[PDB]
């Protein structure tokens, strides 16, 4: 093969792997911050839904 072909093939390979590595580091930091703060869509442990609440007037007023 031509030296130019190997040169530009290597540059394309290096760009792809650098992008993947930076994305992996971003994923790790995102996971840590999401677990610590809890506000993202991940690590959202479910709680009790509020459609199971009876809102009718009950038989005793003090409730």
């Amino acid at each position: 093969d031509a030296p130019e072909k190997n040169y530009e093939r290597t540059m394309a390979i290096l760009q792809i792997e650098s992008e993947k590595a930076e994305l992996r580091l971003k994923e790790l930091e995102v996971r840590r911050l999401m677990r610590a703060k809890g506000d993202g869509p991940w690590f959202q442990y479910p709680t009790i839904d509020k459609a199971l609440i009876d809102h009718s007037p009950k038989a005793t007023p003090d409730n």
Binding site: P57, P61, D62, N63
Partner: protein, 57 residues
């Protein structure tokens, strides 16, 4: 937390309907038919604000 609130004993004093339960049970239907308006106002307010301190008058 907060100091709980309570009306004074002069606000709770009232003349009492001092009759037995048989007097109430005998004339229950006439009492329900004749005095519906203040009874139902009291019941609506007592069920609405859920507080006996605000439902005294």
């Amino acid at each position: 937390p907060g100091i709980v609130e309570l009306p004074s004993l002069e606000d709770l004093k009232v003349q009492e309907v001092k009759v037995s339960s048989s007097v109430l049970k005998a004339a229950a239907h006439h009492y329900g038919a004749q005095c519906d308006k203040p009874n139902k106002e009291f019941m609506l307010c007592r069920w609405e604000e859920k507080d006996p301190r605000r439902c005294l008058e």
